[PDB]
mmCIF file of C-alpha atoms and ligand atoms in Angstrom:
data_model
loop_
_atom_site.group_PDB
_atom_site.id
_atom_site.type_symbol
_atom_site.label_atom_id
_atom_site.label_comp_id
_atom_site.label_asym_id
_atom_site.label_seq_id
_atom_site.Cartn_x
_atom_site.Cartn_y
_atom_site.Cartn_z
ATOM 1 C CA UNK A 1 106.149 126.454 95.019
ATOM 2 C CA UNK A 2 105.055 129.789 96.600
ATOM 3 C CA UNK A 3 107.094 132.614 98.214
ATOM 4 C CA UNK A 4 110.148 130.256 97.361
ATOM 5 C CA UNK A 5 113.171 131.431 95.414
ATOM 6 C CA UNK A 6 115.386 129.745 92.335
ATOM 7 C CA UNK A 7 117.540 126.610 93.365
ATOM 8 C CA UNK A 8 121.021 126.280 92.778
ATOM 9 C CA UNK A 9 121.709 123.782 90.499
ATOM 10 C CA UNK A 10 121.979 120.454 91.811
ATOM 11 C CA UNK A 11 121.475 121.953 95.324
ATOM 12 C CA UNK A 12 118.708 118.863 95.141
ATOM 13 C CA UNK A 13 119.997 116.040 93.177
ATOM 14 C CA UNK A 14 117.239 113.587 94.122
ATOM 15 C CA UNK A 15 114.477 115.858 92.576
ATOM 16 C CA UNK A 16 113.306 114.327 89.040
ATOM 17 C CA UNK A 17 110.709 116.427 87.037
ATOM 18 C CA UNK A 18 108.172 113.410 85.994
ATOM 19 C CA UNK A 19 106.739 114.124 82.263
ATOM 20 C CA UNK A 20 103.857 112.817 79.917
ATOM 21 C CA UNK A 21 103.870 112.228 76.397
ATOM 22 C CA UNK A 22 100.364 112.688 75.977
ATOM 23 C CA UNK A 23 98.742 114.833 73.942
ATOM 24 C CA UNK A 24 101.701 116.360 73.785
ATOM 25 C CA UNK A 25 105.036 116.490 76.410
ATOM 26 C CA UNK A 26 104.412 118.610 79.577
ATOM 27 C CA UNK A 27 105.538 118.395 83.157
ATOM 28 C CA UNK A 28 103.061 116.444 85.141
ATOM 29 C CA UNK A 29 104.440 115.455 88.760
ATOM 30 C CA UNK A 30 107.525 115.896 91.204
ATOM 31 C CA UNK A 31 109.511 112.847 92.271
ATOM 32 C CA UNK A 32 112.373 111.447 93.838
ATOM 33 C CA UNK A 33 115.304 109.190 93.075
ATOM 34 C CA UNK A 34 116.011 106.501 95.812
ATOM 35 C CA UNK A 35 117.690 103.726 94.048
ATOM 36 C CA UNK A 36 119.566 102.871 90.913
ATOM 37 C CA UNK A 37 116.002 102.303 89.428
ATOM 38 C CA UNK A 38 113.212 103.947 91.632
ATOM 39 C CA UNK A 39 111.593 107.180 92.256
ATOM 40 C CA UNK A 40 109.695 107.369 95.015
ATOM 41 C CA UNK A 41 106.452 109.960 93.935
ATOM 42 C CA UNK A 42 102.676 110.485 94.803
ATOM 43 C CA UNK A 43 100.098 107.616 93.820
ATOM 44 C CA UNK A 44 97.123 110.826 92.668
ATOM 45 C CA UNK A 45 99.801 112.160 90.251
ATOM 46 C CA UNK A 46 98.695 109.271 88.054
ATOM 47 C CA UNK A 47 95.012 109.811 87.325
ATOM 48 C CA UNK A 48 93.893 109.037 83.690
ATOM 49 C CA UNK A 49 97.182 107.399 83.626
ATOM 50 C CA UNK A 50 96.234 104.051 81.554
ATOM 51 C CA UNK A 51 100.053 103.319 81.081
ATOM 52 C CA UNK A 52 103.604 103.527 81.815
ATOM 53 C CA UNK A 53 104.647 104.406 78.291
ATOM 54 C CA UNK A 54 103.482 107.909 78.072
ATOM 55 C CA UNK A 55 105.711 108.749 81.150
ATOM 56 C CA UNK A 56 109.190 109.957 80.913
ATOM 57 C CA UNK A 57 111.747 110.877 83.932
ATOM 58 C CA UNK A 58 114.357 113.669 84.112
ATOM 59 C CA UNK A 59 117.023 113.576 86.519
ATOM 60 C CA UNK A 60 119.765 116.479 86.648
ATOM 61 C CA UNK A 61 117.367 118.641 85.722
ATOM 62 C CA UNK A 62 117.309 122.784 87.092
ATOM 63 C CA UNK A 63 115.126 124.668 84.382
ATOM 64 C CA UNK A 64 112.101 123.347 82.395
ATOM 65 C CA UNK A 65 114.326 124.355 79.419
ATOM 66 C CA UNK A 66 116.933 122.070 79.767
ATOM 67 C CA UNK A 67 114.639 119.575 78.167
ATOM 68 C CA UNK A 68 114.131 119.324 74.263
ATOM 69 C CA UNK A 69 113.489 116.484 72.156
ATOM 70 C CA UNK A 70 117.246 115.443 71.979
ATOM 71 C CA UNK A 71 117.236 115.444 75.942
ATOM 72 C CA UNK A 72 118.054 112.183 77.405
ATOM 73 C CA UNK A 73 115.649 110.333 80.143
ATOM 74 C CA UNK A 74 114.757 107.562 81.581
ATOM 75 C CA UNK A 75 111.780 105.344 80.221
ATOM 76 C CA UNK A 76 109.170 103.837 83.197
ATOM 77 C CA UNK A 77 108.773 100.025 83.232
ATOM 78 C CA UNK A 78 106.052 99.916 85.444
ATOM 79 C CA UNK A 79 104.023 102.008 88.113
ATOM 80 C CA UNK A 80 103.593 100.636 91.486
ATOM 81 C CA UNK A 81 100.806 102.909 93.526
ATOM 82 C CA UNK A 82 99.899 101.400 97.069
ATOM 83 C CA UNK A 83 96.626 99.103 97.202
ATOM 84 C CA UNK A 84 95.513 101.208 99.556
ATOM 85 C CA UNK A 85 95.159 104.373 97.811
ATOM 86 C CA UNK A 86 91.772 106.070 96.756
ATOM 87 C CA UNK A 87 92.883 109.667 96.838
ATOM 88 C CA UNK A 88 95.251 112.161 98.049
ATOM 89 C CA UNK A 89 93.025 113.754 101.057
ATOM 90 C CA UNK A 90 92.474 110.300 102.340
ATOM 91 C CA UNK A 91 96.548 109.065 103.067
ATOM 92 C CA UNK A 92 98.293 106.669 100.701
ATOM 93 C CA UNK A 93 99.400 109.211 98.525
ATOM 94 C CA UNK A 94 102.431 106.937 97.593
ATOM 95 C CA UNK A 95 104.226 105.583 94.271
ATOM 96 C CA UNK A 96 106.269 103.481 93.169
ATOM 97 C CA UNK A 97 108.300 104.354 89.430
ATOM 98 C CA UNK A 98 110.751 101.305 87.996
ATOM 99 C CA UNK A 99 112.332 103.101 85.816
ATOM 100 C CA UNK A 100 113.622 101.127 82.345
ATOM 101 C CA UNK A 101 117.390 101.437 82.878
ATOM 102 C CA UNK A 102 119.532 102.602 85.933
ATOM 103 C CA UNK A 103 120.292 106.040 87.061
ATOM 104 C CA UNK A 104 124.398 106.675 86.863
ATOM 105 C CA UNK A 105 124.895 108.784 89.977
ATOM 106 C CA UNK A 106 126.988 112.268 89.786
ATOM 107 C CA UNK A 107 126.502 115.233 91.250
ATOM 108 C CA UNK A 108 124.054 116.303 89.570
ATOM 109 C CA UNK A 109 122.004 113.122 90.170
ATOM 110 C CA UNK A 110 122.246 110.999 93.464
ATOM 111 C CA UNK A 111 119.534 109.058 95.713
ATOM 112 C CA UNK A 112 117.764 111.010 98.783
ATOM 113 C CA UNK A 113 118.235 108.380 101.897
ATOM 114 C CA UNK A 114 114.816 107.403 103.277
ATOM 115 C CA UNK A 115 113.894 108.274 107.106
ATOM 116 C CA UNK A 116 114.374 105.371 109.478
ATOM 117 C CA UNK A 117 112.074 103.893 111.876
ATOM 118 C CA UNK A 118 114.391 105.340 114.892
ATOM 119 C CA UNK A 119 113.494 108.963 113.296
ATOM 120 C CA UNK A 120 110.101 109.979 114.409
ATOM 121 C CA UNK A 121 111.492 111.463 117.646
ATOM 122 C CA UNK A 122 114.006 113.689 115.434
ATOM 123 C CA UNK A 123 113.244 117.108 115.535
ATOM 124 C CA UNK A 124 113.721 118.603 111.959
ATOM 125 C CA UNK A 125 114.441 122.321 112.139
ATOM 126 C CA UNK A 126 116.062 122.550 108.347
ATOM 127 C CA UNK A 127 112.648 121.178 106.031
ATOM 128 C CA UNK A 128 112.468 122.069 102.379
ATOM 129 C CA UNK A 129 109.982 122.196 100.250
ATOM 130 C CA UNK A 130 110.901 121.988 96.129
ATOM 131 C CA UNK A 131 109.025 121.634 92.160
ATOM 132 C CA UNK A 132 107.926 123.385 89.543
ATOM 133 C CA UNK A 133 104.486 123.960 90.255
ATOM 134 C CA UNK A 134 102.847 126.812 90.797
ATOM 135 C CA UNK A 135 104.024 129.953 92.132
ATOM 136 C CA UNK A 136 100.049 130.767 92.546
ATOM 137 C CA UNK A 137 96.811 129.113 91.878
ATOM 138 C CA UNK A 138 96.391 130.590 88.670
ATOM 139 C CA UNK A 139 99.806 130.099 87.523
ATOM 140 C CA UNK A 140 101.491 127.760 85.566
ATOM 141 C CA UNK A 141 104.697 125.366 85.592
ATOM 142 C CA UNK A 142 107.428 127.398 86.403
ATOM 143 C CA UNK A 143 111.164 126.970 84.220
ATOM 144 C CA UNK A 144 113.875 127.099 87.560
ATOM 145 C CA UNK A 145 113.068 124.403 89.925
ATOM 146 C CA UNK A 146 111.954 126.359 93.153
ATOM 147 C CA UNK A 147 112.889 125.797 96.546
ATOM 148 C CA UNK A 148 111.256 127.091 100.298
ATOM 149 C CA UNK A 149 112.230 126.582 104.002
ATOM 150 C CA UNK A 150 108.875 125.618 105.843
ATOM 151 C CA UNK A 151 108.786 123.980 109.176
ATOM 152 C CA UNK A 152 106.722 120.962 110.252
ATOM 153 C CA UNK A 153 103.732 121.323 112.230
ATOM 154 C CA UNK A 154 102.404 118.648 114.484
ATOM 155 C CA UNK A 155 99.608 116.338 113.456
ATOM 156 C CA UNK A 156 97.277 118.097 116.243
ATOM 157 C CA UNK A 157 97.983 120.993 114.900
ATOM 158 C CA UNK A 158 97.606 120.454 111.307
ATOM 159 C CA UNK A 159 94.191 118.821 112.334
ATOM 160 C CA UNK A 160 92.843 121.845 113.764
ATOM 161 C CA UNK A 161 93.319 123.598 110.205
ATOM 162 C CA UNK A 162 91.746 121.111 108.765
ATOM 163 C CA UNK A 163 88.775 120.144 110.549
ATOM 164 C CA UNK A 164 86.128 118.676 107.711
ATOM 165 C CA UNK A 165 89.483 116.370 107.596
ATOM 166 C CA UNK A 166 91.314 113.333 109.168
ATOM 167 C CA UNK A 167 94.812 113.919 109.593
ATOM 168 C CA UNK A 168 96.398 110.749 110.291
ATOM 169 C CA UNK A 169 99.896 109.762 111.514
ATOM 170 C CA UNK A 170 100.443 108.582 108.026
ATOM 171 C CA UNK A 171 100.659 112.054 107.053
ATOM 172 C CA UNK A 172 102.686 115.038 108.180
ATOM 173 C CA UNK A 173 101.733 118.694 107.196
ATOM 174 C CA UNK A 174 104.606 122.239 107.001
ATOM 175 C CA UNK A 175 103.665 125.735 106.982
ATOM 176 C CA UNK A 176 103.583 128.639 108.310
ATOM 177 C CA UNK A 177 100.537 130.143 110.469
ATOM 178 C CA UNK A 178 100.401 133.485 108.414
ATOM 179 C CA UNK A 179 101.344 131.078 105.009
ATOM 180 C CA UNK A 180 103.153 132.815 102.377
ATOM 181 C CA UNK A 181 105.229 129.656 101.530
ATOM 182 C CA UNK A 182 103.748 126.384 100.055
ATOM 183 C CA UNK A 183 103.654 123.927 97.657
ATOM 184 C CA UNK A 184 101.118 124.087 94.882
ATOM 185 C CA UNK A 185 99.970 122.414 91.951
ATOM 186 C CA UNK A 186 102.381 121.063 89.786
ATOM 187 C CA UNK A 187 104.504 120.200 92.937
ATOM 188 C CA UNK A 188 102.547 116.764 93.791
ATOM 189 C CA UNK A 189 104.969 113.925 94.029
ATOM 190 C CA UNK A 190 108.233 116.161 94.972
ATOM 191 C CA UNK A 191 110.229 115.739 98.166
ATOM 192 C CA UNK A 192 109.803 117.122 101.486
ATOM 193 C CA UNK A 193 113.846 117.042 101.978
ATOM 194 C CA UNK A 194 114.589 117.539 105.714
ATOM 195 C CA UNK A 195 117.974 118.491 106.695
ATOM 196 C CA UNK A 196 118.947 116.282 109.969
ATOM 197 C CA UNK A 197 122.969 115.967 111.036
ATOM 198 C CA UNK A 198 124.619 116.725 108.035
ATOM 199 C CA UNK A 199 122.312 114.338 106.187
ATOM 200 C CA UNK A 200 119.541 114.629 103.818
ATOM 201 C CA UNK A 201 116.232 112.761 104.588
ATOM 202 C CA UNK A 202 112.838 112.238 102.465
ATOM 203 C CA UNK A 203 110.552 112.741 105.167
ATOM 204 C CA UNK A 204 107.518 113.568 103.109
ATOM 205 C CA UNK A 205 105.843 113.458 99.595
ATOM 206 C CA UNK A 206 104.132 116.633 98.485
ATOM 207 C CA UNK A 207 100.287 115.828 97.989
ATOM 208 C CA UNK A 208 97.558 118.336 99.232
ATOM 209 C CA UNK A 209 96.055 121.077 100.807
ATOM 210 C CA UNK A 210 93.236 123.908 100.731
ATOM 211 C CA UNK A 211 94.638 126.193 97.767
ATOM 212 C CA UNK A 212 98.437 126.868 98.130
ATOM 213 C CA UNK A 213 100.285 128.942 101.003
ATOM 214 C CA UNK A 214 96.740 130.709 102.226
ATOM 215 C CA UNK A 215 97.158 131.182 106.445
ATOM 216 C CA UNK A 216 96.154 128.670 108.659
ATOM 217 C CA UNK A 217 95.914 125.847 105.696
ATOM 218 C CA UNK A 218 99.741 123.743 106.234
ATOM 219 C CA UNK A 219 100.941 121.628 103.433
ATOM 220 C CA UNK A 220 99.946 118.026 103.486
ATOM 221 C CA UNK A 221 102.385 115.591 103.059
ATOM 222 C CA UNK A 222 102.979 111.733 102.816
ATOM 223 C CA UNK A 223 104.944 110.644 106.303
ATOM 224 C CA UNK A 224 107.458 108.556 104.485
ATOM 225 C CA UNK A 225 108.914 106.891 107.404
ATOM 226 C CA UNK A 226 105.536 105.103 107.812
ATOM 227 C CA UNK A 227 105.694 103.371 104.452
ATOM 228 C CA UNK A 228 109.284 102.341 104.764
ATOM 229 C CA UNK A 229 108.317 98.716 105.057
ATOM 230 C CA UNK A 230 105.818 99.200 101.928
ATOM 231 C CA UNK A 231 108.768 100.422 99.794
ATOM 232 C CA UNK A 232 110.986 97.674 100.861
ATOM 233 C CA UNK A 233 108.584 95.076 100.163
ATOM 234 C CA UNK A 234 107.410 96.499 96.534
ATOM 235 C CA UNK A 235 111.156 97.067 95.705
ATOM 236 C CA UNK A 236 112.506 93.840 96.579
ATOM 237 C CA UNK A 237 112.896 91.655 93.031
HETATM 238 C C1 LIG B 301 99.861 118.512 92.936
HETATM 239 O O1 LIG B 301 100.994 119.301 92.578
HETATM 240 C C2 LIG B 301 99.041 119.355 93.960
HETATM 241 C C3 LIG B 301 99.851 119.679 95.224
HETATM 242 C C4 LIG B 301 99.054 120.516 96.224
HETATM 243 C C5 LIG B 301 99.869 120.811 97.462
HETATM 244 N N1 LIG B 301 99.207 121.915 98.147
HETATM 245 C C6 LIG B 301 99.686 122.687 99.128
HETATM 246 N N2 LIG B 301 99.025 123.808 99.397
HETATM 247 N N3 LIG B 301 100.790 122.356 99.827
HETATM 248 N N4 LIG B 301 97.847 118.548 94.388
HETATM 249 C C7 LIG B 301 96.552 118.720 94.083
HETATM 250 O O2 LIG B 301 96.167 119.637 93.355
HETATM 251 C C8 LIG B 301 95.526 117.718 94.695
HETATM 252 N N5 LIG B 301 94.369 118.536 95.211
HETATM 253 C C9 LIG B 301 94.411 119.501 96.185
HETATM 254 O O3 LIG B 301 95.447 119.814 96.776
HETATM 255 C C10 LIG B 301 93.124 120.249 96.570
HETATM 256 C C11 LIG B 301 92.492 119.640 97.818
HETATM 257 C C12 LIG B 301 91.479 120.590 98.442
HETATM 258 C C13 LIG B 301 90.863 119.985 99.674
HETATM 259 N N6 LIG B 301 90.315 121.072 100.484
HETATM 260 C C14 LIG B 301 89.457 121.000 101.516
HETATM 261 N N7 LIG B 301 89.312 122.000 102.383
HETATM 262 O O4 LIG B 301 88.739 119.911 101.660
HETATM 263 N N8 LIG B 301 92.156 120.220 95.473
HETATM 264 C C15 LIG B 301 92.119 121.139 94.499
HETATM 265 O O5 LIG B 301 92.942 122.099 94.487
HETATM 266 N N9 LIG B 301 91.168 120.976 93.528
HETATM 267 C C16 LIG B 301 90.961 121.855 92.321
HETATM 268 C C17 LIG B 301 89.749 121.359 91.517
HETATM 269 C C18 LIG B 301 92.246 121.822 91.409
HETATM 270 C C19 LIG B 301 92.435 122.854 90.398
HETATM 271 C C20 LIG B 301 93.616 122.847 89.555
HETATM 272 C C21 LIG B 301 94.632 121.807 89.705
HETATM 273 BR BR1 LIG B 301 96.176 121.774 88.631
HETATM 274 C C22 LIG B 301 94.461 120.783 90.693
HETATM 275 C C23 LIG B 301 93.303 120.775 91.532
HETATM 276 C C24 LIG B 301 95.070 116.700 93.585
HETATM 277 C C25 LIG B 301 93.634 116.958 93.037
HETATM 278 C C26 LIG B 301 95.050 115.305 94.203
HETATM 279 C C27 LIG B 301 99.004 118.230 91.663
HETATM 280 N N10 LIG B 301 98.449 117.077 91.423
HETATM 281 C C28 LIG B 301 97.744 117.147 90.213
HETATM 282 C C29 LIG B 301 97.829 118.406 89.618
HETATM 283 S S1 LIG B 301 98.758 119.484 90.526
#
C-alpha cells in the first residue's frame, strides 16, 4: 500500500495474509474471508502455483511478525480460479481458496459480506484500500498491515487513464488524479472494503495497474458484485 498508514488491529478482520511454503515461507497474496471455509482472492496471485499444498492462510493477522513456525493457519484444500481467466489486465482476476478446516469467527477474524446485485447504484464515499505490499515499487513486504482511503472512479474515467487498455464493467478502478495512494505489489488478492450504511462490503479485489500510486494511473480492481453468481455457483457443495 502507498501513502497509507498502520491499521489498527482487527480494524479489518476479513483480511488474510495468503503464504507459500516454497522455497522457503514468504507472503505471497492478499485475501479475504467470506465463509466458514472460503477466501475470496485474485486468480494471477497463483502463477507457478502447481499445488494447493505449498499455500498456507493467516487470519487475525496485523504484523508480518506475528507469524513463526509455531503460528497456527489454515491448510488450502483446493484452488478454484475462474475458467475464464488468462491474466490480470484482461478481467477475471478472481479466486476461489477452500480452505482445509473452518474459520472460528471472533473479533479478530469474521467474514466481509459480498455486494448485492441491488448495489451498483450505491454511491460509496468510505472505500479502503489494505495489504502488505509495497509501500513503493522497489520496496518490499511491509510487517503492519497498511490501510488507505481512495475513492472510486468511474469506468469512463478509469478508461481514459488507461487507453492501450479495455476497462470493462467487470472491473472497477480507485485513485486519486494527483495519486499518492495505491495499492502495489504484494497487495494482489486483498479487499477493496467499501464502507456503505454502517456495513462493510467487498466491492473489489486488488489486481493491477501502471506502477503503484503514479497520477493519472487509478487502481484496478475486480467488480465483485459481477461475479456474485460465479461465487455462489463454485461454493455450493
Ligand atoms: C499484486 O500485489 C500486484 C498489485 C498491483 C496493484 N497496482 C496498483 N497500482 N493499484 N499486481 C501485479 O503486480 C500485476 N501486474 C501489474 O500490476 C503491472 C501491470 C502493468 C500494465 N501497464 C500498462 N500500462 O499496460 N505489471 C507489472 O508491474 N509488471 C512488472 C514486471 C512487475 C515487477 C515486480 C512485481 Br512484484 C510484479 C510485477 C501482476 C503481474 C499480475 C502482485 N501480484 C504478484 C506480485 S505482486
Amino acid at each position: 500500500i502507498v501513502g497509507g498508514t498502520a491499521s489498527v488491529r482487527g480494524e479489518w478482520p476479513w483480511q488474510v495474509t495468503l503464504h507459500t511454503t516454497s522455497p522457503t515461507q514468504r507472503h505471497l497474496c492478499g485475501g479475504s474471508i467470506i465463509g466458514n471455509q472460503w477466501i475470496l482472492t485474485a486468480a494471477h496471485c497463483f502463477y507457478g502455483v502447481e499445488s494447493p499444498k505449498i499455500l498456507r492462510v493467516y487470519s487475525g493477522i496485523l504484523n508480518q511478525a506475528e507469524i513463526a513456525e509455531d503460528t497456527s493457519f489454515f491448510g488450502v484444500q483446493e484452488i478454484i480460479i475462474h475458467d475464464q481467466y488468462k491474466m490480470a489486465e484482461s478481467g477475471y482476476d478472481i479466486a476461489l481458496l477452500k480452505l482445509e478446516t473452518t474459520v472460528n469467527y471472533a473479533d479478530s477474524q469474521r467474514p466481509i459480506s459480498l455486494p448485492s446485485k441491488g448495489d451498483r447504484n450505491v454511491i460509496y464515499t468510505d472505500c479502503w484500500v489494505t495489504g502488505w505490499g509495497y509501500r513503493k515499487l522497489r520496496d518490499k513486504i511491509q510487517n503492519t498491515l497498511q490501510k488507505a482511503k481512495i475513492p472510486l472512479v468511474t469506468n469512463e474515467e478509469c478508461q481514459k487513464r488507461y487507453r492501450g487498455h479495455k476497462i470493462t464493467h467487470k472491473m472497477i478502478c480507485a485513485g486519486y488524479r494527483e495519486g499518492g495512494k495505491d495499492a502495489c505489489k504484494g497487495d494482489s488478492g486483498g479487499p477493496l472494503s467499501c464502507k456503505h450504511n454502517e456495513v462493510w462490503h467487498l466491492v473489489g479485489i486488488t489486481s493491477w495497474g501502471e506502477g503503484c500510486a503514479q497520477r493519472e494511473r487509478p487502481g484496478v480492481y475486480t467488480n465483485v458484485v459481477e461475479y456474485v453468481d460465479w461465487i455462489l455457483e463454485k461454493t455450493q457443495a
